[PDB]
Design a protein around this nucleic acid. Structure first.
Lengths: 90, 99, 129, 123, 130, 103, 85
DNA sequence: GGTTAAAACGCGGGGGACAGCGCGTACGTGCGTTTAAGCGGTGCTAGAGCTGTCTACGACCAATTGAGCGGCCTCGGCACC
DNA sequence: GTGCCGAGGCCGCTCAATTGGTCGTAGACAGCTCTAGCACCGCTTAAACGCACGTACGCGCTGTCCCCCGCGTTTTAACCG
């Protein structure tokens, strides 16, 4: 079932997160830096595709991190190793 | 009329709502879909907060680059051109949305 | 008192743009490098002075950190060992010098809890952790 | 456009209202010279986007005046101990190492030495 | 130089002050006058006020800075007296120098002792209720 | 003129003395090694390339030919982190103000 | 048994030992003490000496003297309030 | 002849399969919000003129810094009480 | 017999020391941009005007680690290339 939907997302290309909650999330972060910030519709969608593929690569690496430790599930330990070994977090 | 940072009309012709904890917009179906696109069968429950936290770290860094790029030209609107310039510096580059 | 447009009191480098604002780092070389290197087709006089101060601050801090590190090593001379120690000690310097390798440097003495006596423990004592 | 004189102009303010257009200036107030115009200058160099209230400026005005008393007071004691009639950067540098903490004194000496060098070297 | 004649053009700085010579912002001349006014010595050296202003300028810079950082955490763009106290108590070096200093009109660090929270689920000893 | 030994006058795109002068001012009594000068000289060159490399991008995207402190101010924030940029801008801004008031 | 015969480099701070703490305790009106005091007192004393000598050496260094006179100690002690007559 | 790895297989834990429970979704509707337009209004960014203070170019000379040298203080190591 | 305390000692660390040509700061008088005034339309502003997407509630199936539980893994040893 979980691998049944693997085919759907790996065969069809689509956005996998809600549109406006992402827009609300980036707005609330931007408002702290500068209030009354104006966001273009293309700009917020462009960041979404980069953000989605950023986690897809992270979720791809964490999958191989689990199989390294004789594991299938990915845990908070897996995400710590991937970010640090890549220089993103440390 | 006139307007500075914005919201010059006031009165009853404008409305804004407080956004404080909208990070939770990335919910369980949304988080698992990106995990599914990564090809993982099972994802733990504790990484849902971590994935949202990772996204916040990822978004806060790219926003700084985009805002600074936009503030250089003093333009109120953040165009798609400034985003891809920010993306180039951080390594995570997206083709499209301007060229 | 009449001297025309400009007087003839001094006609050869009466003070330099460097040290005109109390700046040690050269500004003519930076100005020359900014135009010799095809960064832009034109350059403004405000660019080198700001850039010279930025370079001085970055140079000063790492030297101060390395100098203090050299003092902890009981050596007055600055060795690339201290320069590597200063960069790796602070996360702020780690971000800038992330993929950079320093010649004759070193590596911070980091050890995990599973690479020492006991199964997985990190109590130890002072001068550690 | 006038040529002043030294004799009658000491404290030349209003005593009787013999004025035209603008009213006479009030009697001069005891000059409480403050570092407010200088502290604000430094504030805009580190935090250009931050303001400052007068209540906290009164603290900083009292802070620098009281701090200046301590550092100069210690330097005054130092001169008597050394039987020295003059005070310069050397005695204050040691006084900084005494009154100020470890890291704080080192930064003050480092910047102070650089500032002193630029004054002496330049004309 | 002799003859009491006009020396000519002023090669030495005229618009720039003594502080501008060293690049400082605080008035060295006032500090130079204050040392003589305060009767700290029979004579005062030329480098005495220059070093004093630089130390005072650096101390002013560090304090404002730290106060400005605390102001941002409190969502206020005006530095209030409470912001200074938070920075004073947070920094050990500033705490040592300003241990006995009192800041007027507010200022207190939210220090809570661990004793004040029982946190035993209000479960008494050998029984949950009293 | 050039008949004497002269061919060895070249290069000197480096910061050896300037780092040495800053080193003595920041730390009064300390020494530096000729080895450590090599790392510092190359590090400054890369730093100069990094900030100027970004400043080239800002100038091109904004239809501006000249390079000013404002574009470099953007580069400092883009390159250095928050704490590093905070001190960097203060030193840079103070350099411009004193330079304009000096002659 | 138990015996050591090394003089220097290993018994500088630990020279106070057990009885001296008791000796100072009696002058301080203390009937009994715990064995944990023998470790803090070395640290507590060292902090007191380090603060005084930091100023005292600074006075000695400034006066261009290689010897610390008795009056130098008074100057360091006066600032902290522990004045010596 | 001593050092690590490497065969054999310790050994009590960690994970998937064995199972629930609780959400989060995301289709029909109406009301203004924000992003793009439509055309100015003075303000800044790049065009040259005049003759001058500064960097690049070019010269030698005694001194100035960094290599290395020789005694010393520090370190790891074997062998008795 | 063991582990850590030491002693003698081995090359470089920091100081100086006399000679060749490397680099930096003062001095002139030739073109060129530095920086200073002015133009008219183009890029960004505010306030309306419309248009589907987005929030709140629905019926449904989806998963994580709780317990008990094997045999292949890589350390722990004393002995060879």
């Amino acid at each position: 079932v979980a691998l049944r939907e693997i085919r759907r997302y790996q065969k069809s290309t689509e956005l996998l997160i809600r549109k406006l909650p992402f827009q609300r999330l980036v707005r609330e972060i931007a408002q702290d830096f500068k209030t009354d910030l104006r966001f273009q519709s293309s700009a917020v969608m462009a960041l979404q595709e980069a953000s989605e593929a950023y986690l897809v690569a992270l979720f791809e690496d964490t999958n191989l991190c689990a199989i390294h430790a004789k594991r299938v599930t990915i845990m908070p330990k897996d995400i710590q190793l991937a970010r640090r070994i890549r220089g993103e977090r440390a | 009329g006139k307007g500075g940072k914005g919201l010059g009309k006031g009165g009853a012709k404008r409305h804004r709502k407080v956004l404080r904890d909208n990070i939770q917009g990335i919910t369980k179906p949304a988080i698992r879909r990106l995990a599914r696109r990564g090809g993982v069968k099972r994802i733990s429950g504790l990484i849902y907060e971590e994935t949202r936290g990772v996204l916040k770290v990822f978004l806060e860094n790219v926003i700084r680059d985009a805002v600074t790029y936009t503030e250089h030209a003093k333009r109120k609107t953040v165009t798609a051109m400034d985003v891809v310039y920010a993306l180039k510096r951080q390594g995570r580059t997206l083709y499209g949305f301007g060229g | 008192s009449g001297r025309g447009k400009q007087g003839g009191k001094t006609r050869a480098k009466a003070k330099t743009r460097s040290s005109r604002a109390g700046l040690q780092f050269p500004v003519g070389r930076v100005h020359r490098l900014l135009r010799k290197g095809n960064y832009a087709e034109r350059v403004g006089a405000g660019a080198p002075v700001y850039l010279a101060a930025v370079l001085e601050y970055l140079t000063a801090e790492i030297l101060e950190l390395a100098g203090n590190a050299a003092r902890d090593n009981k050596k007055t001379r600055i060795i690339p060992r201290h320069l590597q120690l200063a960069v790796r000690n602070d996360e702020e310097l780690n971000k800038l010098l992330g993929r950079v390798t320093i010649a004759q440097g070193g590596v911070l003495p980091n050890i995990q809890s599973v690479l020492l006596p006991k199964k997985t423990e990190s109590s130890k004592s002072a001068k550690s952790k | 456009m006038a040529k002043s004189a030294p004799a009658p102009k000491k404290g030349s303010k209003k005593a009787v209202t013999k004025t035209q257009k603008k009213d006479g200036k009030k009697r001069r107030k005891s000059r409480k010279e403050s570092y407010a115009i200088y502290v604000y200058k430094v504030l805009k160099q580190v935090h250009p986007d931050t303001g400052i209230s007068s209540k906290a400026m009164s603290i900083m005005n009292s802070f620098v005046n009281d701090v200046f008393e301590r550092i100069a007071g210690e330097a005054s004691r130092l001169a008597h101990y050394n039987k020295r009639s003059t005070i310069t950067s050397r005695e204050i540098q040691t006084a900084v190492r005494l009154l100020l903490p470890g890291e704080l004194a080192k930064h003050a000496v480092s910047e102070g030495t650089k500032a002193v060098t630029k004054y002496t070297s330049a004309k």
